[PDB]
Design a binder for this molecule. Structure first.
Ligand SMILES: Cc1cc2nc3c(=O)[nH]c(=O)nc-3n(C[C@H](O)[C@H](O)[C@H](O)COP(=O)(O)OP(=O)(O)OC[C@H]3O[C@@H](n4cnc5c(N)ncnc54)[C@H](O)[C@@H]3O)c2cc1C
Ligand SMILES: Cc1cc2nc3c(=O)[nH]c(=O)nc-3n(C[C@H](O)[C@H](O)[C@H](O)COP(=O)(O)OP(=O)(O)OC[C@H]3O[C@@H](n4cnc5c(N)ncnc54)[C@H](O)[C@@H]3O)c2cc1C
Ligand SMILES: Cc1ccc(-c2cn3cccc(C)c3n2)cc1S(=O)(=O)N1CCNCC1
Ligand SMILES: Cc1ccc(-c2cn3cccc(C)c3n2)cc1S(=O)(=O)N1CCNCC1
Ligand SMILES: [Zn+2]
Ligand SMILES: [Zn+2]
Lengths: 229, 229
Protein backbone atom coordinates (compact mmCIF):
# COMPACT_ATOMS: atom_id res chain seq x y z
CA UNK A 1 0.00 0.00 0.00
CA UNK A 2 1.88 3.02 -1.32
CA UNK A 3 5.54 2.14 -0.77
CA UNK A 4 7.59 5.14 -1.92
CA UNK A 5 11.11 4.65 -3.31
CA UNK A 6 13.69 7.35 -4.04
CA UNK A 7 16.56 6.41 -6.34
CA UNK A 8 19.54 8.80 -6.07
CA UNK A 9 21.42 8.18 -9.30
CA UNK A 10 25.00 9.32 -10.10
CA UNK A 11 26.05 8.51 -13.67
CA UNK A 12 26.70 10.70 -16.71
CA UNK A 13 25.60 8.24 -19.41
CA UNK A 14 22.05 6.81 -19.62
CA UNK A 15 23.25 3.84 -21.71
CA UNK A 16 25.81 2.90 -19.03
CA UNK A 17 25.64 -0.17 -16.81
CA UNK A 18 24.48 2.10 -13.96
CA UNK A 19 21.79 3.48 -16.27
CA UNK A 20 20.51 -0.04 -16.95
CA UNK A 21 20.55 -0.85 -13.24
CA UNK A 22 18.64 2.37 -12.58
CA UNK A 23 16.06 1.69 -15.31
CA UNK A 24 15.55 -1.88 -14.14
CA UNK A 25 14.83 -0.60 -10.63
CA UNK A 26 12.34 1.96 -11.97
CA UNK A 27 10.66 -0.67 -14.19
CA UNK A 28 10.50 -3.38 -11.53
CA UNK A 29 9.36 -1.23 -8.60
CA UNK A 30 6.76 0.53 -10.74
CA UNK A 31 5.47 -2.78 -12.12
CA UNK A 32 5.04 -3.74 -8.45
CA UNK A 33 2.78 -0.72 -7.90
CA UNK A 34 5.39 1.15 -5.84
CA UNK A 35 5.73 4.93 -6.08
CA UNK A 36 9.14 5.76 -7.64
CA UNK A 37 11.23 8.97 -7.86
CA UNK A 38 14.70 9.38 -9.40
CA UNK A 39 17.16 12.13 -8.51
CA UNK A 40 19.35 12.11 -11.63
CA UNK A 41 22.17 14.15 -10.12
CA UNK A 42 24.17 14.80 -13.30
CA UNK A 43 21.08 15.70 -15.37
CA UNK A 44 20.07 18.13 -12.61
CA UNK A 45 23.57 19.70 -12.59
CA UNK A 46 23.26 19.10 -8.85
CA UNK A 47 25.37 21.51 -6.82
CA UNK A 48 27.95 19.53 -4.81
CA UNK A 49 29.75 22.31 -2.90
CA UNK A 50 28.82 23.23 0.70
CA UNK A 51 28.86 27.08 0.56
CA UNK A 52 27.16 30.13 2.06
CA UNK A 53 24.87 30.15 -1.00
CA UNK A 54 22.96 27.33 0.73
CA UNK A 55 21.42 29.77 3.24
CA UNK A 56 19.16 32.58 2.22
CA UNK A 57 18.24 34.95 4.98
CA UNK A 58 20.24 36.47 7.79
CA UNK A 59 23.31 34.55 8.92
CA UNK A 60 23.66 33.62 12.59
CA UNK A 61 27.22 35.07 12.25
CA UNK A 62 28.12 36.83 8.98
CA UNK A 63 31.73 37.63 9.96
CA UNK A 64 32.87 34.00 10.53
CA UNK A 65 31.01 31.45 8.40
CA UNK A 66 30.30 28.06 9.99
CA UNK A 67 28.54 25.84 7.43
CA UNK A 68 27.22 23.29 9.94
CA UNK A 69 25.81 25.93 12.29
CA UNK A 70 24.26 28.11 9.57
CA UNK A 71 22.50 25.29 7.71
CA UNK A 72 21.16 23.90 11.00
CA UNK A 73 19.68 27.32 11.78
CA UNK A 74 18.47 27.79 8.20
CA UNK A 75 16.72 24.41 8.31
CA UNK A 76 14.67 25.38 11.38
CA UNK A 77 14.05 28.85 9.90
CA UNK A 78 13.16 27.37 6.45
CA UNK A 79 15.74 29.52 4.69
CA UNK A 80 17.76 26.73 3.05
CA UNK A 81 18.32 26.78 -0.70
CA UNK A 82 15.37 25.16 -2.46
CA UNK A 83 17.42 22.49 -4.28
CA UNK A 84 18.28 21.20 -0.78
CA UNK A 85 14.70 21.24 0.48
CA UNK A 86 13.47 19.61 -2.77
CA UNK A 87 15.71 16.63 -1.98
CA UNK A 88 14.71 16.58 1.69
CA UNK A 89 11.08 16.39 0.49
CA UNK A 90 11.80 13.29 -1.63
CA UNK A 91 13.72 11.67 1.25
CA UNK A 92 11.14 12.38 3.94
CA UNK A 93 8.42 10.75 1.82
CA UNK A 94 10.54 7.75 0.84
CA UNK A 95 10.28 4.38 2.56
CA UNK A 96 13.43 3.15 0.77
CA UNK A 97 16.29 5.22 -0.67
CA UNK A 98 18.48 3.47 -3.25
CA UNK A 99 21.88 4.89 -4.15
CA UNK A 100 22.99 3.87 -7.67
CA UNK A 101 26.55 4.85 -8.53
CA UNK A 102 29.92 3.61 -9.77
CA UNK A 103 32.62 3.39 -7.12
CA UNK A 104 34.94 6.42 -7.41
CA UNK A 105 38.08 6.15 -5.26
CA UNK A 106 36.58 3.65 -2.80
CA UNK A 107 33.60 6.00 -2.36
CA UNK A 108 30.71 7.78 -4.10
CA UNK A 109 31.23 10.19 -7.03
CA UNK A 110 31.77 13.74 -5.81
CA UNK A 111 28.35 14.87 -7.12
CA UNK A 112 26.76 12.25 -4.86
CA UNK A 113 29.05 13.14 -1.96
CA UNK A 114 27.69 16.68 -2.31
CA UNK A 115 24.12 15.41 -2.07
CA UNK A 116 25.05 13.75 1.24
CA UNK A 117 26.96 16.81 2.50
CA UNK A 118 24.16 19.27 1.73
CA UNK A 119 20.87 17.34 2.02
CA UNK A 120 21.52 15.47 5.30
CA UNK A 121 21.78 18.58 7.48
CA UNK A 122 21.22 18.82 11.22
CA UNK A 123 17.58 19.17 12.13
CA UNK A 124 16.58 17.06 9.11
CA UNK A 125 18.68 13.90 9.11
CA UNK A 126 20.04 13.88 12.69
CA UNK A 127 20.11 15.94 15.87
CA UNK A 128 22.04 16.16 19.16
CA UNK A 129 20.91 13.93 20.69
CA UNK A 130 19.24 11.87 17.95
CA UNK A 131 21.77 9.93 15.88
CA UNK A 132 22.69 6.39 14.94
CA UNK A 133 19.71 4.35 16.16
CA UNK A 134 17.89 7.55 17.20
CA UNK A 135 18.68 9.31 13.90
CA UNK A 136 15.84 11.34 12.44
CA UNK A 137 15.48 9.17 9.35
CA UNK A 138 14.72 6.14 11.55
CA UNK A 139 12.00 3.97 10.10
CA UNK A 140 13.46 4.29 6.60
CA UNK A 141 15.49 1.83 4.56
CA UNK A 142 18.63 2.60 2.56
CA UNK A 143 20.48 0.47 0.01
CA UNK A 144 23.77 0.99 -1.84
CA UNK A 145 23.82 -0.38 -5.41
CA UNK A 146 27.44 0.07 -6.51
CA UNK A 147 29.38 -0.98 -9.62
CA UNK A 148 33.17 -1.37 -9.46
CA UNK A 149 36.14 -1.48 -11.77
CA UNK A 150 37.76 -4.27 -9.79
CA UNK A 151 36.64 -7.89 -9.71
CA UNK A 152 35.04 -9.62 -6.74
CA UNK A 153 38.24 -11.61 -6.14
CA UNK A 154 40.26 -8.37 -5.93
CA UNK A 155 37.86 -7.16 -3.22
CA UNK A 156 38.60 -9.92 -0.72
CA UNK A 157 40.39 -9.76 2.64
CA UNK A 158 43.51 -11.17 0.94
CA UNK A 159 43.10 -9.46 -2.46
CA UNK A 160 45.00 -6.23 -3.04
CA UNK A 161 41.96 -3.98 -2.54
CA UNK A 162 40.91 -5.50 0.79
CA UNK A 163 37.41 -6.78 1.41
CA UNK A 164 34.56 -4.97 -0.33
CA UNK A 165 32.88 -4.30 3.03
CA UNK A 166 35.84 -2.14 4.15
CA UNK A 167 34.89 0.63 1.72
CA UNK A 168 31.20 0.50 2.73
CA UNK A 169 31.98 1.63 6.32
CA UNK A 170 31.94 5.44 5.78
CA UNK A 171 28.73 5.27 3.71
CA UNK A 172 26.65 2.64 5.53
CA UNK A 173 27.74 3.44 9.10
CA UNK A 174 29.25 6.92 9.11
CA UNK A 175 26.36 8.32 7.03
CA UNK A 176 23.17 6.23 6.66
CA UNK A 177 23.19 4.51 10.07
CA UNK A 178 24.19 7.81 11.69
CA UNK A 179 21.06 9.34 10.18
CA UNK A 180 18.90 6.51 11.53
CA UNK A 181 18.51 4.45 8.35
CA UNK A 182 18.37 0.72 8.55
CA UNK A 183 20.74 -0.55 5.87
CA UNK A 184 19.82 -3.40 3.56
CA UNK A 185 22.71 -5.47 2.25
CA UNK A 186 24.63 -3.79 -0.58
CA UNK A 187 24.14 -4.70 -4.22
CA UNK A 188 27.68 -4.81 -5.68
CA UNK A 189 27.97 -5.45 -9.43
CA UNK A 190 31.67 -6.21 -9.74
CA UNK A 191 33.61 -5.15 -12.83
CA UNK A 192 30.92 -4.93 -15.56
CA UNK A 193 33.52 -3.44 -17.95
CA UNK A 194 35.44 -6.73 -18.22
CA UNK A 195 32.51 -9.07 -17.56
CA UNK A 196 31.23 -11.06 -20.53
CA UNK A 197 27.88 -10.27 -22.14
CA UNK A 198 26.37 -13.29 -20.36
CA UNK A 199 27.73 -12.20 -16.97
CA UNK A 200 26.56 -8.60 -17.45
CA UNK A 201 23.03 -9.81 -18.25
CA UNK A 202 23.24 -12.06 -15.20
CA UNK A 203 24.27 -9.18 -12.96
CA UNK A 204 21.34 -7.15 -14.32
CA UNK A 205 18.93 -10.04 -13.76
CA UNK A 206 20.03 -10.66 -10.14
CA UNK A 207 19.25 -7.03 -9.31
CA UNK A 208 15.80 -7.23 -10.92
CA UNK A 209 15.06 -10.52 -9.17
CA UNK A 210 16.22 -9.15 -5.81
CA UNK A 211 13.92 -6.14 -6.20
CA UNK A 212 10.91 -8.43 -6.50
CA UNK A 213 11.34 -9.38 -2.83
CA UNK A 214 13.01 -6.21 -1.52
CA UNK A 215 10.30 -5.43 1.06
CA UNK A 216 10.67 -8.85 2.71
CA UNK A 217 14.35 -8.33 3.52
CA UNK A 218 15.84 -7.59 6.96
CA UNK A 219 18.56 -4.94 7.37
CA UNK A 220 22.17 -5.84 8.12
CA UNK A 221 23.52 -5.22 11.64
CA UNK A 222 25.49 -2.09 10.72
CA UNK A 223 28.42 -2.67 13.08
CA UNK A 224 32.20 -2.79 13.00
CA UNK A 225 31.95 -6.60 13.21
CA UNK A 226 29.78 -6.81 10.08
CA UNK A 227 32.24 -4.63 8.17
CA UNK A 228 35.56 -5.84 9.57
CA UNK A 229 35.17 -8.91 11.82
CA UNK B 1 66.99 21.49 0.37
CA UNK B 2 64.60 22.72 -2.30
CA UNK B 3 61.51 20.65 -1.62
CA UNK B 4 58.09 21.50 -3.09
CA UNK B 5 54.84 21.19 -1.13
CA UNK B 6 51.31 21.46 -2.47
CA UNK B 7 48.53 22.01 0.08
CA UNK B 8 45.03 21.11 -1.14
CA UNK B 9 42.75 23.07 1.19
CA UNK B 10 38.96 22.56 1.53
CA UNK B 11 37.38 24.98 4.02
CA UNK B 12 35.00 27.91 3.45
CA UNK B 13 36.18 30.13 6.35
CA UNK B 14 39.69 31.66 6.57
CA UNK B 15 39.38 32.19 10.36
CA UNK B 16 38.47 28.52 10.85
CA UNK B 17 40.55 25.88 12.62
CA UNK B 18 41.29 24.35 9.22
CA UNK B 19 42.34 27.80 8.03
CA UNK B 20 44.78 28.22 10.92
CA UNK B 21 46.20 24.74 10.28
CA UNK B 22 46.71 25.71 6.62
CA UNK B 23 48.28 29.07 7.48
CA UNK B 24 50.62 27.35 9.94
CA UNK B 25 51.82 24.93 7.26
CA UNK B 26 52.41 27.77 4.81
CA UNK B 27 54.34 29.79 7.42
CA UNK B 28 56.34 26.85 8.75
CA UNK B 29 57.29 25.30 5.41
CA UNK B 30 57.96 28.74 3.91
CA UNK B 31 60.25 29.67 6.85
CA UNK B 32 62.22 26.43 6.26
CA UNK B 33 63.00 27.40 2.66
CA UNK B 34 60.53 25.01 1.01
CA UNK B 35 58.52 25.97 -2.08
CA UNK B 36 54.82 26.23 -1.15
CA UNK B 37 51.65 26.23 -3.27
CA UNK B 38 48.05 26.23 -1.99
CA UNK B 39 44.96 25.08 -3.89
CA UNK B 40 42.14 26.86 -2.01
CA UNK B 41 39.32 24.80 -3.49
CA UNK B 42 36.40 26.92 -2.26
CA UNK B 43 38.14 30.19 -3.16
CA UNK B 44 38.71 28.80 -6.67
CA UNK B 45 35.10 27.56 -6.94
CA UNK B 46 36.70 24.26 -7.97
CA UNK B 47 34.42 22.12 -10.15
CA UNK B 48 33.67 18.79 -8.41
CA UNK B 49 31.52 17.17 -11.09
CA UNK B 50 33.07 14.61 -13.47
CA UNK B 51 31.43 15.60 -16.79
CA UNK B 52 32.22 15.80 -20.52
CA UNK B 53 33.24 19.43 -19.94
CA UNK B 54 36.53 18.00 -18.66
CA UNK B 55 37.54 17.18 -22.26
CA UNK B 56 38.24 20.02 -24.68
CA UNK B 57 37.86 19.72 -28.42
CA UNK B 58 35.65 16.81 -29.42
CA UNK B 59 35.16 13.45 -27.82
CA UNK B 60 36.62 10.07 -28.74
CA UNK B 61 33.03 8.76 -28.86
CA UNK B 62 30.37 11.48 -28.56
CA UNK B 63 27.31 9.21 -28.73
CA UNK B 64 28.03 7.17 -25.55
CA UNK B 65 29.97 9.05 -22.84
CA UNK B 66 32.50 7.07 -20.77
CA UNK B 67 34.25 9.44 -18.36
CA UNK B 68 37.18 7.12 -17.63
CA UNK B 69 38.05 6.35 -21.25
CA UNK B 70 37.58 9.91 -22.49
CA UNK B 71 39.70 11.52 -19.80
CA UNK B 72 42.38 8.86 -20.28
CA UNK B 73 42.59 9.64 -24.01
CA UNK B 74 42.32 13.38 -23.33
CA UNK B 75 45.28 13.27 -20.95
CA UNK B 76 47.48 11.47 -23.51
CA UNK B 77 46.31 13.91 -26.20
CA UNK B 78 46.74 17.00 -23.99
CA UNK B 79 43.09 18.01 -24.31
CA UNK B 80 41.86 18.05 -20.70
CA UNK B 81 40.19 21.14 -19.26
CA UNK B 82 42.72 23.63 -17.92
CA UNK B 83 41.53 23.57 -14.30
CA UNK B 84 42.40 19.85 -14.21
CA UNK B 85 45.76 20.33 -15.95
CA UNK B 86 46.61 23.30 -13.66
CA UNK B 87 46.22 20.99 -10.66
CA UNK B 88 48.18 18.17 -12.32
CA UNK B 89 51.06 20.60 -12.92
CA UNK B 90 51.20 21.47 -9.20
CA UNK B 91 51.02 17.78 -8.25
CA UNK B 92 53.64 16.65 -10.78
CA UNK B 93 56.04 19.26 -9.32
CA UNK B 94 55.27 18.49 -5.68
CA UNK B 95 57.39 16.32 -3.42
CA UNK B 96 54.65 16.33 -0.76
CA UNK B 97 50.88 16.84 -1.03
CA UNK B 98 49.11 17.85 2.19
CA UNK B 99 45.30 17.66 2.25
CA UNK B 100 43.69 19.98 4.81
CA UNK B 101 39.99 19.43 5.38
CA UNK B 102 37.22 18.90 7.94
CA UNK B 103 35.80 15.39 8.08
CA UNK B 104 32.46 15.27 6.21
CA UNK B 105 30.49 12.02 6.52
CA UNK B 106 33.61 9.99 7.38
CA UNK B 107 35.26 11.31 4.19
CA UNK B 108 36.47 14.45 2.40
CA UNK B 109 34.10 17.32 1.57
CA UNK B 110 32.62 16.89 -1.88
CA UNK B 111 34.67 19.75 -3.34
CA UNK B 112 37.84 17.90 -2.34
CA UNK B 113 36.35 14.58 -3.50
CA UNK B 114 35.88 16.21 -6.90
CA UNK B 115 39.54 17.22 -6.93
CA UNK B 116 40.47 13.56 -6.48
CA UNK B 117 37.92 12.32 -9.05
CA UNK B 118 39.00 14.80 -11.74
CA UNK B 119 42.73 15.45 -11.16
CA UNK B 120 43.98 11.91 -10.47
CA UNK B 121 43.09 10.63 -13.92
CA UNK B 122 44.31 7.55 -15.75
CA UNK B 123 47.70 8.01 -17.37
CA UNK B 124 48.55 10.79 -14.91
CA UNK B 125 48.18 9.19 -11.48
CA UNK B 126 47.95 5.50 -12.40
CA UNK B 127 47.62 3.11 -15.29
CA UNK B 128 47.93 -0.57 -16.09
CA UNK B 129 50.35 -1.77 -14.76
CA UNK B 130 51.26 1.19 -12.56
CA UNK B 131 49.22 1.21 -9.35
CA UNK B 132 49.73 0.81 -5.60
CA UNK B 133 53.53 0.57 -5.08
CA UNK B 134 54.07 1.18 -8.80
CA UNK B 135 51.50 3.95 -9.24
CA UNK B 136 52.54 6.88 -11.38
CA UNK B 137 53.11 9.24 -8.43
CA UNK B 138 55.70 6.99 -6.80
CA UNK B 139 58.41 9.02 -5.13
CA UNK B 140 55.94 11.52 -3.68
CA UNK B 141 54.62 11.83 -0.13
CA UNK B 142 51.02 12.50 0.87
CA UNK B 143 49.54 13.54 4.21
CA UNK B 144 45.94 13.88 5.45
CA UNK B 145 45.45 16.69 8.01
CA UNK B 146 41.84 16.20 9.11
CA UNK B 147 39.70 17.82 11.81
CA UNK B 148 36.66 16.05 13.26
CA UNK B 149 33.51 16.89 15.16
CA UNK B 150 33.78 13.77 17.28
CA UNK B 151 36.30 13.21 20.08
CA UNK B 152 39.19 10.78 20.13
CA UNK B 153 37.30 8.47 22.53
CA UNK B 154 34.39 8.10 20.10
CA UNK B 155 36.83 7.14 17.34
CA UNK B 156 38.12 3.98 19.04
CA UNK B 157 37.56 0.39 17.94
CA UNK B 158 34.77 -0.11 20.51
CA UNK B 159 33.42 3.47 20.55
CA UNK B 160 30.40 4.60 18.54
CA UNK B 161 32.40 5.71 15.51
CA UNK B 162 34.95 2.89 15.36
CA UNK B 163 38.69 3.38 14.98
CA UNK B 164 39.57 6.55 13.09
CA UNK B 165 41.78 4.36 10.91
CA UNK B 166 38.60 2.72 9.57
CA UNK B 167 37.59 5.84 7.68
CA UNK B 168 41.13 6.56 6.50
CA UNK B 169 41.11 3.36 4.38
CA UNK B 170 39.37 4.79 1.26
CA UNK B 171 41.53 7.92 1.32
CA UNK B 172 44.96 6.60 2.37
CA UNK B 173 44.89 3.20 0.62
CA UNK B 174 42.22 3.27 -2.09
CA UNK B 175 43.27 6.70 -3.33
CA UNK B 176 46.75 7.90 -2.28
CA UNK B 177 48.57 4.55 -2.07
CA UNK B 178 46.79 3.35 -5.21
CA UNK B 179 48.42 6.22 -7.14
CA UNK B 180 51.89 5.40 -5.79
CA UNK B 181 52.11 7.92 -2.93
CA UNK B 182 53.89 6.95 0.20
CA UNK B 183 51.47 8.01 2.92
CA UNK B 184 52.71 9.87 5.97
CA UNK B 185 50.93 9.32 9.28
CA UNK B 186 47.62 11.26 9.34
CA UNK B 187 47.37 14.46 11.34
CA UNK B 188 44.04 14.31 13.19
CA UNK B 189 42.99 17.26 15.35
CA UNK B 190 39.99 15.81 17.17
CA UNK B 191 36.99 17.97 18.00
CA UNK B 192 38.44 21.51 18.08
CA UNK B 193 34.90 22.93 18.36
CA UNK B 194 34.38 21.58 21.89
CA UNK B 195 38.05 21.80 22.91
CA UNK B 196 39.18 24.53 25.29
CA UNK B 197 41.36 27.41 24.18
CA UNK B 198 44.38 25.65 25.68
CA UNK B 199 43.85 22.33 23.88
CA UNK B 200 43.10 24.08 20.56
CA UNK B 201 46.43 25.91 20.70
CA UNK B 202 48.10 22.66 21.73
CA UNK B 203 46.66 20.97 18.66
CA UNK B 204 47.90 23.78 16.43
CA UNK B 205 51.32 23.60 18.10
CA UNK B 206 51.61 19.84 17.58
CA UNK B 207 51.10 20.45 13.85
CA UNK B 208 53.57 23.33 13.68
CA UNK B 209 56.18 21.27 15.56
CA UNK B 210 55.54 18.20 13.38
CA UNK B 211 56.30 20.27 10.26
CA UNK B 212 59.84 21.00 11.57
CA UNK B 213 60.85 17.40 10.90
CA UNK B 214 58.40 16.33 8.17
CA UNK B 215 61.24 15.25 5.85
CA UNK B 216 62.66 12.84 8.45
CA UNK B 217 59.43 10.84 8.78
CA UNK B 218 59.13 7.35 7.48
CA UNK B 219 55.84 6.50 5.68
CA UNK B 220 53.29 4.19 7.27
CA UNK B 221 52.91 0.61 6.02
CA UNK B 222 49.67 1.33 4.13
CA UNK B 223 48.15 -2.13 4.55
CA UNK B 224 44.85 -3.60 5.69
CA UNK B 225 46.56 -4.73 8.92
CA UNK B 226 47.67 -1.15 9.73
CA UNK B 227 44.12 0.05 9.14
CA UNK B 228 42.04 -2.74 10.75
CA UNK B 229 44.37 -5.06 12.70
C1 LIG C 1 37.09 8.73 -11.15
C2 LIG C 1 36.93 7.34 -11.13
C3 LIG C 1 37.29 6.67 -9.97
C4 LIG C 1 37.16 5.28 -9.88
N1 LIG C 1 37.54 4.63 -8.71
C5 LIG C 1 37.41 3.25 -8.63
C6 LIG C 1 37.77 2.57 -7.46
O1 LIG C 1 38.20 3.17 -6.49
N2 LIG C 1 37.64 1.19 -7.39
C7 LIG C 1 37.13 0.48 -8.48
O2 LIG C 1 37.00 -0.74 -8.41
N3 LIG C 1 36.77 1.18 -9.64
C8 LIG C 1 36.90 2.56 -9.72
N4 LIG C 1 36.55 3.20 -10.86
C9 LIG C 1 35.98 2.38 -11.97
C10 LIG C 1 34.43 2.46 -11.94
O3 LIG C 1 33.90 2.11 -10.66
C11 LIG C 1 33.82 1.59 -13.05
O4 LIG C 1 34.34 1.98 -14.32
C12 LIG C 1 32.29 1.68 -13.05
O5 LIG C 1 31.83 1.10 -11.83
C13 LIG C 1 31.75 0.83 -14.22
O6 LIG C 1 30.31 0.82 -14.43
P1 LIG C 1 29.70 1.81 -15.56
O7 LIG C 1 28.22 1.76 -15.53
O8 LIG C 1 30.36 3.14 -15.56
O9 LIG C 1 30.34 1.10 -16.87
P2 LIG C 1 29.83 0.84 -18.33
O10 LIG C 1 31.11 0.90 -19.06
O11 LIG C 1 28.80 1.83 -18.65
O12 LIG C 1 29.25 -0.70 -18.52
C14 LIG C 1 30.21 -1.64 -19.00
C15 LIG C 1 29.87 -2.47 -20.27
O13 LIG C 1 28.45 -2.20 -19.83
C16 LIG C 1 27.53 -2.74 -20.80
N5 LIG C 1 26.09 -2.52 -20.42
C17 LIG C 1 25.32 -1.48 -20.14
N6 LIG C 1 24.07 -1.93 -19.94
C18 LIG C 1 24.05 -3.25 -20.11
C19 LIG C 1 23.08 -4.20 -20.05
N7 LIG C 1 21.85 -3.82 -19.73
N8 LIG C 1 23.31 -5.49 -20.28
C20 LIG C 1 24.60 -5.88 -20.61
N9 LIG C 1 25.59 -4.89 -20.68
C21 LIG C 1 25.30 -3.60 -20.44
C22 LIG C 1 28.10 -1.43 -21.49
O14 LIG C 1 27.45 -1.16 -22.72
C23 LIG C 1 29.41 -2.10 -21.68
O15 LIG C 1 29.26 -3.27 -22.50
C24 LIG C 1 36.67 4.55 -10.96
C25 LIG C 1 36.31 5.23 -12.13
C26 LIG C 1 36.43 6.61 -12.23
C27 LIG C 1 36.03 7.23 -13.44
C1 LIG D 1 28.46 18.31 6.28
C2 LIG D 1 29.20 17.96 7.42
C3 LIG D 1 29.51 16.62 7.66
C4 LIG D 1 30.24 16.27 8.80
N1 LIG D 1 30.56 14.92 9.03
C5 LIG D 1 31.30 14.59 10.17
C6 LIG D 1 31.64 13.25 10.44
O1 LIG D 1 31.30 12.33 9.70
N2 LIG D 1 32.37 12.95 11.60
C7 LIG D 1 32.77 13.96 12.46
O2 LIG D 1 33.42 13.68 13.46
N3 LIG D 1 32.43 15.27 12.19
C8 LIG D 1 31.70 15.61 11.04
N4 LIG D 1 31.40 16.91 10.81
C9 LIG D 1 31.89 17.94 11.77
C10 LIG D 1 33.20 18.59 11.20
O3 LIG D 1 34.17 17.59 10.84
C11 LIG D 1 33.82 19.64 12.16
O4 LIG D 1 32.86 20.63 12.53
C12 LIG D 1 35.11 20.30 11.56
O5 LIG D 1 36.15 19.31 11.45
C13 LIG D 1 35.58 21.34 12.54
O6 LIG D 1 36.75 22.06 12.15
P1 LIG D 1 36.52 23.58 11.68
O7 LIG D 1 37.80 24.11 11.15
O8 LIG D 1 35.27 23.79 10.87
O9 LIG D 1 36.08 24.20 13.13
P2 LIG D 1 36.11 25.75 13.65
O10 LIG D 1 34.74 25.92 14.17
O11 LIG D 1 36.57 26.65 12.59
O12 LIG D 1 37.24 25.73 14.82
C14 LIG D 1 36.62 25.47 16.08
C15 LIG D 1 36.71 26.58 17.15
O13 LIG D 1 38.02 26.85 16.43
C16 LIG D 1 38.68 28.00 16.98
N5 LIG D 1 40.00 28.30 16.30
C17 LIG D 1 40.30 28.61 15.03
N6 LIG D 1 41.63 28.84 14.93
C18 LIG D 1 42.17 28.70 16.14
C19 LIG D 1 43.44 28.83 16.59
N7 LIG D 1 44.42 29.15 15.72
N8 LIG D 1 43.76 28.64 17.88
C20 LIG D 1 42.74 28.31 18.77
N9 LIG D 1 41.43 28.18 18.28
C21 LIG D 1 41.17 28.39 16.98
C22 LIG D 1 37.48 28.58 16.12
O14 LIG D 1 37.57 29.99 16.12
C23 LIG D 1 36.46 28.10 17.12
O15 LIG D 1 36.55 28.70 18.40
C24 LIG D 1 30.67 17.25 9.71
C25 LIG D 1 30.35 18.59 9.46
C26 LIG D 1 29.62 18.94 8.32
C27 LIG D 1 29.32 20.29 8.09
C1 LIG E 1 41.46 -0.58 -6.80
C2 LIG E 1 41.11 0.50 -7.81
C3 LIG E 1 41.23 1.83 -7.43
C4 LIG E 1 40.96 2.87 -8.33
C5 LIG E 1 40.51 2.57 -9.61
C6 LIG E 1 40.23 3.65 -10.58
C7 LIG E 1 40.40 5.02 -10.37
N1 LIG E 1 40.08 5.65 -11.52
C8 LIG E 1 40.06 6.96 -11.83
C9 LIG E 1 39.69 7.39 -13.10
C10 LIG E 1 39.34 6.48 -14.10
C11 LIG E 1 39.36 5.13 -13.81
C12 LIG E 1 38.98 4.09 -14.85
C13 LIG E 1 39.75 4.72 -12.44
N2 LIG E 1 39.85 3.49 -11.87
C14 LIG E 1 40.38 1.25 -10.03
C15 LIG E 1 40.63 0.17 -9.18
S1 LIG E 1 40.47 -1.34 -9.76
O1 LIG E 1 40.17 -2.28 -8.74
O2 LIG E 1 39.49 -1.38 -10.82
N3 LIG E 1 41.96 -1.55 -10.42
C16 LIG E 1 42.64 -2.81 -10.12
C17 LIG E 1 44.05 -2.84 -10.71
N4 LIG E 1 44.08 -2.44 -12.13
C18 LIG E 1 43.39 -1.16 -12.32
C19 LIG E 1 41.93 -1.34 -11.89
C1 LIG F 1 29.97 10.24 13.85
C2 LIG F 1 29.51 11.53 13.23
C3 LIG F 1 28.95 11.50 11.95
C4 LIG F 1 28.50 12.67 11.35
C5 LIG F 1 28.63 13.90 12.00
C6 LIG F 1 28.10 15.15 11.38
C7 LIG F 1 27.35 15.26 10.22
N1 LIG F 1 27.03 16.55 10.05
C8 LIG F 1 26.34 17.17 9.09
C9 LIG F 1 26.13 18.55 9.14
C10 LIG F 1 26.64 19.32 10.19
C11 LIG F 1 27.36 18.70 11.20
C12 LIG F 1 27.93 19.46 12.38
C13 LIG F 1 27.55 17.24 11.09
N2 LIG F 1 28.19 16.39 11.92
C14 LIG F 1 29.18 13.97 13.28
C15 LIG F 1 29.65 12.82 13.94
S1 LIG F 1 30.28 12.97 15.42
O1 LIG F 1 31.36 12.08 15.70
O2 LIG F 1 30.71 14.34 15.59
N3 LIG F 1 29.06 12.72 16.45
C16 LIG F 1 29.58 12.37 17.79
C17 LIG F 1 28.43 12.15 18.77
N4 LIG F 1 27.62 13.38 18.85
C18 LIG F 1 27.11 13.70 17.50
C19 LIG F 1 28.27 13.96 16.55
ZN1 LIG G 1 26.38 1.16 11.53
ZN1 LIG H 1 47.79 1.13 1.20
Amino acid sequence: AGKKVLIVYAHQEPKSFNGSLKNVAVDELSRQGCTVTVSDLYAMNFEPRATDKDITGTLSNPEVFNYGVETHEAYKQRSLASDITDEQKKVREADLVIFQFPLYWFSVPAILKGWMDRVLCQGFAFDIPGFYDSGLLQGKLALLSVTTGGTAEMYTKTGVNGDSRYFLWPLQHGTLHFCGFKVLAPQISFAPEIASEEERKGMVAAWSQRLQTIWKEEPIPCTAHWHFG
